[PDB]
Amino acid sequence: DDPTXXQX
């Protein structure tokens, strides 16, 4: 749900 690093 965070874009940052494709975490989710």
Q: Tokens in use for 2?
A: 């965070």
Q: Tokens in use for 6?
A: 């494709």
Q: Tokens in use for 5?
A: 């690093």
The amino acid at residue 6 is X
- Look-up of token digits 């690093």: 5
DSSP 1-8: ---GGG--
**Count of residues in the chain:** 8
Contacts of 5 (CB under 8 A, 6+ apart): none
- Look-up of token digits 């749900």: 1
The amino acid at residue 2 is D
Contacts of 8 (CB under 8 A, 6+ apart): 1, 2
Conformational region of residue 7, where left means phi above 0, alpha means psi within -120 to 50, and beta covers everything else: alpha
